[PDB]
CSV table of C-alpha atoms and ligand atoms in Angstrom, one decimal:
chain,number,residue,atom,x,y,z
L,1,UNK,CA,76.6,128.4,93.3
L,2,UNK,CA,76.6,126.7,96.7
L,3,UNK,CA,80.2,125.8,97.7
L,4,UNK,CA,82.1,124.5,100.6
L,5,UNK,CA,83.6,127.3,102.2
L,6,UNK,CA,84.7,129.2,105.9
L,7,UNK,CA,81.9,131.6,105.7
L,8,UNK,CA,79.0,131.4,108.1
L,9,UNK,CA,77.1,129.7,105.7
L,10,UNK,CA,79.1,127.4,104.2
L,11,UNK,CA,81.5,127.0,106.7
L,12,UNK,CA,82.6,124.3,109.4
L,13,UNK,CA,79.9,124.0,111.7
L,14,UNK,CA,77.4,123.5,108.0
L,15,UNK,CA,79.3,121.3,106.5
L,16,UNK,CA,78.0,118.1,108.6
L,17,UNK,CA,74.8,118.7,105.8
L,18,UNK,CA,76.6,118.2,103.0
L,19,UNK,CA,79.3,116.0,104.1
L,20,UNK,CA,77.8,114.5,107.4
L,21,UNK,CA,81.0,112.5,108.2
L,22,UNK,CA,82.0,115.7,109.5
L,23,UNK,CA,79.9,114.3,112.8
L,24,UNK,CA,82.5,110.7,112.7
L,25,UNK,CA,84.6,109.1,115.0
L,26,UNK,CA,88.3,109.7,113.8
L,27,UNK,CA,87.5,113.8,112.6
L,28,UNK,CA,90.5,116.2,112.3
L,29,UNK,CA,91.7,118.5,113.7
L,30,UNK,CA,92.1,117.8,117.4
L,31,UNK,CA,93.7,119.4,120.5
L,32,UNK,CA,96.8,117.9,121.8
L,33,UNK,CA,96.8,117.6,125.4
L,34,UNK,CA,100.6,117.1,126.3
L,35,UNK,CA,99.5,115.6,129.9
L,36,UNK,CA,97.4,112.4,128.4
L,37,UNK,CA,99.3,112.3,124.7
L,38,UNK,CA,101.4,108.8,126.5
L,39,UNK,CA,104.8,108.3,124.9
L,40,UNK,CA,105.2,105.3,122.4
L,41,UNK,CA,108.7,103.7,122.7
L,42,UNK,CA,107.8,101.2,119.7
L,43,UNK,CA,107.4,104.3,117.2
L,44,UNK,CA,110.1,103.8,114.9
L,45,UNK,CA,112.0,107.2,113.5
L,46,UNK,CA,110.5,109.2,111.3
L,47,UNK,CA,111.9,109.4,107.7
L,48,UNK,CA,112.2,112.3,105.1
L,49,UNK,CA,112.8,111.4,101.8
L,50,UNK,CA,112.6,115.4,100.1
L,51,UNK,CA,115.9,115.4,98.6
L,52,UNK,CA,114.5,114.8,95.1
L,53,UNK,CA,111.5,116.4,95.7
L,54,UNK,CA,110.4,118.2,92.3
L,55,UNK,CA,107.3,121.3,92.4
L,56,UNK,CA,105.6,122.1,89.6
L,57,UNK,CA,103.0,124.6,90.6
L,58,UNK,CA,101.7,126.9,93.1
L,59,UNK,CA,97.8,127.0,92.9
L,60,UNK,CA,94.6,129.0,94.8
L,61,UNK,CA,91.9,126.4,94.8
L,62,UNK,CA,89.1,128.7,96.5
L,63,UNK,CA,90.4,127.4,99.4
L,64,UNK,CA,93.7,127.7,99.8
L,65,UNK,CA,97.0,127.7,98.5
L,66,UNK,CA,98.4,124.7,97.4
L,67,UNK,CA,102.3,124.0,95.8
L,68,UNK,CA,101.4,120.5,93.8
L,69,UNK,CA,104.5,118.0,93.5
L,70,UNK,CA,105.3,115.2,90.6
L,71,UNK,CA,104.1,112.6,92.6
L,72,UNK,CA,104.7,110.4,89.5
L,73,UNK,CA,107.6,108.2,91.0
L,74,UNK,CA,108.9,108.2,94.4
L,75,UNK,CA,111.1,111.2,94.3
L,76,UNK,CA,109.8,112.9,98.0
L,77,UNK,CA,108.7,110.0,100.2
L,78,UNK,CA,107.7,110.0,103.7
L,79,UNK,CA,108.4,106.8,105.8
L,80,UNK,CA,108.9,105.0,109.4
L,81,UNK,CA,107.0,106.3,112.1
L,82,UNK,CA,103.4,105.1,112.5
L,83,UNK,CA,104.0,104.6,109.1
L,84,UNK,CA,103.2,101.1,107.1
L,85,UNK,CA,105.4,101.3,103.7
L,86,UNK,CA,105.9,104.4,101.7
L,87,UNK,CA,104.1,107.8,101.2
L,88,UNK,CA,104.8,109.9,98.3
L,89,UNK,CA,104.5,113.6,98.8
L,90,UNK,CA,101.8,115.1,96.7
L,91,UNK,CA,101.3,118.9,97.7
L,92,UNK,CA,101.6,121.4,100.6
L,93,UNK,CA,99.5,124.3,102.2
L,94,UNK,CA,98.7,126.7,104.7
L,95,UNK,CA,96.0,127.4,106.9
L,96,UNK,CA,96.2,130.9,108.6
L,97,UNK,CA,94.4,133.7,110.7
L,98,UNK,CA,93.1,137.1,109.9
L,99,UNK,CA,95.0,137.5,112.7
L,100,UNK,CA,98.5,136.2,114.4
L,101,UNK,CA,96.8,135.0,117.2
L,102,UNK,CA,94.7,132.2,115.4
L,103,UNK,CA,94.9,130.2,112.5
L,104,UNK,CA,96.1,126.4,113.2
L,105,UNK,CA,93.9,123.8,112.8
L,106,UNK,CA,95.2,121.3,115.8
L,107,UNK,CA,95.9,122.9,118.9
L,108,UNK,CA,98.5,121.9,121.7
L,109,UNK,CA,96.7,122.3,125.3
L,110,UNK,CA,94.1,124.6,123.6
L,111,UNK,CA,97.2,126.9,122.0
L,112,UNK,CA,96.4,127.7,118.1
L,113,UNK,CA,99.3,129.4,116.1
L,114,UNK,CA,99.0,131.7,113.5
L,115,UNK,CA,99.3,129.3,111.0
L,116,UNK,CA,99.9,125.5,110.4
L,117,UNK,CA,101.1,123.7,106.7
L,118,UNK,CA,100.4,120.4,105.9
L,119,UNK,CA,102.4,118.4,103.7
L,120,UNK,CA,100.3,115.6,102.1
L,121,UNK,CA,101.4,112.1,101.2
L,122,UNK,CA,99.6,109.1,99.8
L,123,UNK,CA,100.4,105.4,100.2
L,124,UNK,CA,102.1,103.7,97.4
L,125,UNK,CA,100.0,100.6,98.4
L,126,UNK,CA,97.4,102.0,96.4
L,127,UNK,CA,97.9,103.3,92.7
L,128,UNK,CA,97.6,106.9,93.1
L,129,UNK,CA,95.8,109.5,95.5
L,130,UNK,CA,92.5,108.8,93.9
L,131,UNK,CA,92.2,105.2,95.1
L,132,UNK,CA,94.5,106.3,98.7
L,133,UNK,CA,92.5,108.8,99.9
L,134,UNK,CA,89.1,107.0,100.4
L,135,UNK,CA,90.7,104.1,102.3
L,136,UNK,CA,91.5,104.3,106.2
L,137,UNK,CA,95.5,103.9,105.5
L,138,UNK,CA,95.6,106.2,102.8
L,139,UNK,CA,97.3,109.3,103.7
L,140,UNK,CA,99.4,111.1,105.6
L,141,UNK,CA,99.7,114.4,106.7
L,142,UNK,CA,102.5,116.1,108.1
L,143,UNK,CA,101.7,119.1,110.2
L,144,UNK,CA,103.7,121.6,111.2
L,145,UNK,CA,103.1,125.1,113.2
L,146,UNK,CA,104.4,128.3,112.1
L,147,UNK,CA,104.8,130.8,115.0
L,148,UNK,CA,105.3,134.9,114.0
L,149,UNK,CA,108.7,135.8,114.4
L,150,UNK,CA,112.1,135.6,112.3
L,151,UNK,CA,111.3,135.8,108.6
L,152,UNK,CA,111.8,132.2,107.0
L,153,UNK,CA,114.3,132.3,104.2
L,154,UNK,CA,112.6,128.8,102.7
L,155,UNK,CA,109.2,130.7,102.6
L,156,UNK,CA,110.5,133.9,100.8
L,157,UNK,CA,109.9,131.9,97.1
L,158,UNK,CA,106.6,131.1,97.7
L,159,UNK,CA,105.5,134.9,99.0
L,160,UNK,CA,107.0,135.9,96.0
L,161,UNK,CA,104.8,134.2,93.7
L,162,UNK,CA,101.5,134.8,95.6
L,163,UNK,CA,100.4,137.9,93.7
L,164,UNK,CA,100.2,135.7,90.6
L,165,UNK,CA,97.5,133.6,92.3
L,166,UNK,CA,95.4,136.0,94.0
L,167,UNK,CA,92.1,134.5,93.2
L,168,UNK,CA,90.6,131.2,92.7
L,169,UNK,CA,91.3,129.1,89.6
L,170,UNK,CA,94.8,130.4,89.0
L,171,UNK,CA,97.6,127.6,89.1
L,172,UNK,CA,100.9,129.1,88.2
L,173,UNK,CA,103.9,127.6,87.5
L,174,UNK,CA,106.4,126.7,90.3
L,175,UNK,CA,109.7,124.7,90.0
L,176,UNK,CA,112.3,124.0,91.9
L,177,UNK,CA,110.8,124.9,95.4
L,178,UNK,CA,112.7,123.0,98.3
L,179,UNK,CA,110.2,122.1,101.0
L,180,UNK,CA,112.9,120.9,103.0
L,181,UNK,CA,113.4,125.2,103.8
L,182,UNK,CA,110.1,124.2,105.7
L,183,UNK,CA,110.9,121.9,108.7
L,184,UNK,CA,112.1,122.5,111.6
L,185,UNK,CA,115.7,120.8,112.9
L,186,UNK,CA,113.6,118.2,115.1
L,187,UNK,CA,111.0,115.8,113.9
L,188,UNK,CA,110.0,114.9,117.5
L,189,UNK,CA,105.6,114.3,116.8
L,190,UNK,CA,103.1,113.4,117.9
L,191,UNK,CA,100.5,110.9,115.7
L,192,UNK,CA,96.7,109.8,115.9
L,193,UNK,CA,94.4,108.2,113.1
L,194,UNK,CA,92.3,110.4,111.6
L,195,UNK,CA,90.6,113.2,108.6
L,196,UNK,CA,90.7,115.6,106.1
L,197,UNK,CA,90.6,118.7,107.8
L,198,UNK,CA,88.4,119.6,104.5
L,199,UNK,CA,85.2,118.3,102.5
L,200,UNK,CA,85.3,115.9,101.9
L,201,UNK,CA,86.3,114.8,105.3
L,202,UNK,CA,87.2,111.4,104.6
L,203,UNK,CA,88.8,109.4,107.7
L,204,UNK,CA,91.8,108.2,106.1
L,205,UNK,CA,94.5,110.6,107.6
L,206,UNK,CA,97.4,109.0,109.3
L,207,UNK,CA,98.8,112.4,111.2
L,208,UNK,CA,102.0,113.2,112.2
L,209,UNK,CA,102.1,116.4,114.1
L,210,UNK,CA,105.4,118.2,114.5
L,211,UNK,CA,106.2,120.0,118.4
L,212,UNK,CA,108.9,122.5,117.3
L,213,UNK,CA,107.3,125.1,115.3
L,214,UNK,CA,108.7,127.2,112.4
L,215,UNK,CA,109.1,130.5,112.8
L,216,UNK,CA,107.7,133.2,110.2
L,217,UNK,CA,107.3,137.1,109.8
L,218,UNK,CA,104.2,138.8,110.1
L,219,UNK,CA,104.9,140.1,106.7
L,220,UNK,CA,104.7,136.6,105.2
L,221,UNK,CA,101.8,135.5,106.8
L,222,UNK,CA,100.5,139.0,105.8
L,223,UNK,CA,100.8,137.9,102.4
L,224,UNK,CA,98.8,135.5,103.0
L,225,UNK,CA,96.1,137.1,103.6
L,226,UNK,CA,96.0,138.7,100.2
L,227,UNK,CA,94.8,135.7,99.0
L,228,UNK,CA,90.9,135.8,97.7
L,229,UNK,CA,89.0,132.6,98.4
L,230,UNK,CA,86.8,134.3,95.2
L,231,UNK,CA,87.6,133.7,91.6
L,232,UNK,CA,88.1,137.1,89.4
L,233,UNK,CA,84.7,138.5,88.3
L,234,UNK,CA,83.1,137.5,91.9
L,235,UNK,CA,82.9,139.8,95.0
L,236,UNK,CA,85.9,139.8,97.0
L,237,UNK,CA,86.2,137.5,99.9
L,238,UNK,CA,90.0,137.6,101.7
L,239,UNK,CA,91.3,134.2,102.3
L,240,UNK,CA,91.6,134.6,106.0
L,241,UNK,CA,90.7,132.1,108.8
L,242,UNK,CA,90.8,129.1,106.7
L,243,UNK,CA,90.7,126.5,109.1
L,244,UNK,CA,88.7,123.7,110.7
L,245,UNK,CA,88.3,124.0,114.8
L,246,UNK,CA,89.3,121.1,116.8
L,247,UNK,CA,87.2,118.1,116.8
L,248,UNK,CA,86.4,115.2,119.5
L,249,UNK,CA,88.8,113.1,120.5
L,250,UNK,CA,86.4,109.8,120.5
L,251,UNK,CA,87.9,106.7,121.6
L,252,UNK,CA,91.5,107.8,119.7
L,253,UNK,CA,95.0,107.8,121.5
L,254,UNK,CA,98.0,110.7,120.4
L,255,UNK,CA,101.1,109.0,120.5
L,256,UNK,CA,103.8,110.8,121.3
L,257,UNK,CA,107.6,109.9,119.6
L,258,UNK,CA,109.3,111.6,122.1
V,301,ZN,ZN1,77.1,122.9,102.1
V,302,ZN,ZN1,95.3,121.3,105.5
């Protein structure tokens, strides 16, 4: 019965018991002070590789949402940057608010938007996200804001489909979704080693956090909020405030590529 969770039992500040990495040096998420986060002139540009990037489903794991990606051959591929080699794009999702004014995970001098996605890679090095995600260069995460304001047209397919997934255990199918529709024009980031923002927690997160947010409707977020963190047949919980606070910094550096 006892699961992970963003309740007040189960929640963030419990799950150190469980999962007592939770309490390491390289947690995630953090705040990013622009005034310390020190420029890096040796970061090489970053590199999108999405233009064969192929969906096939759009899934509530209890937790989240999550659109899962053929991650079978390198078809979207993140490279450069802090980057060593090539990262294949596995899945994307959200963390959000019950209300616009919260609902990132990182912060940027203590500001949280309404919302922040998180496209995850894993390093080729190893054989699949299995083996990549319990070693230190394993992943990495791109993170990007969303800030309320003009609708996004590249978000419209996946509100669409979000009524079909209401509650957990429901993976629907979901092809053809471009997540290229969700970046903004400048890849300008900032970068520090890392976690999982979720159990299990594991520190093996390269991140690469975007500055220029993308901007959303209230209405889409909204719909994200009709989510259940519940599977059908259990009491109704809405999937709201789904994310991790900021962490210690430790003895970690931000680097910023601009
Ligand atoms: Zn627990
Ligand atoms: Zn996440």
């Amino acid at each position: 019965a006892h699961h992970w969770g963003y309740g007040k039992h189960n929640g963030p500040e419990h799950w150190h018991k469980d999962f007592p990495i939770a309490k390491g040096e390289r947690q995630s998420p953090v705040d990013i002070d622009t005034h310390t986060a020190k420029y890096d002139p040796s970061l090489k540009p970053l590199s999108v590789s999405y233009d064969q990037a192929t969906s096939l489903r759009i899934l509530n794991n209890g937790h989240t949402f999550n659109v899962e990606f053929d991650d079978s051959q390198d078809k979207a591929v993140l490279k450069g940057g802090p980057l060593d080699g090539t990262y294949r794009l596995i899945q994307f999702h959200f963390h959000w608010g019950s209300h616009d004014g919260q609902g990132s995970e990182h912060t940027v001098d203590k500001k949280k938007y309404a919302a922040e996605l998180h496209l995850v890679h894993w390093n080729t090095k190893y054989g699949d996200f299995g083996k990549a995600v319990q070693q230190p260069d394993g992943l990495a995460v791109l993170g990007i804001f969303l800030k309320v304001g003009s609708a996004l047209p590249g978000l419209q397919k996946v509100v669409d489909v979000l009524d079909s997934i209401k509650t957990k255990g429901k993976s629907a199918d979901f092809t053809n979704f471009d997540p290229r529709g969700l970046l903004p024009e400048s890849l300008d980031y900032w970068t520090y080693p890392g976690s999982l923002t979720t159990p299990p927690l594991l520190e093996s997160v390269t991140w690469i956090v975007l500055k220029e947010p993308i901007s959303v409707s209230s209405e889409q977020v909204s719909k994200f909020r009709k989510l259940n963190f519940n599977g059908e047949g259990e009491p109704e919980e809405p999937m709201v405030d789904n994310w991790r606070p900021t962490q210690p910094l430790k003895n970690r550096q931000i680097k910023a590529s601009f």
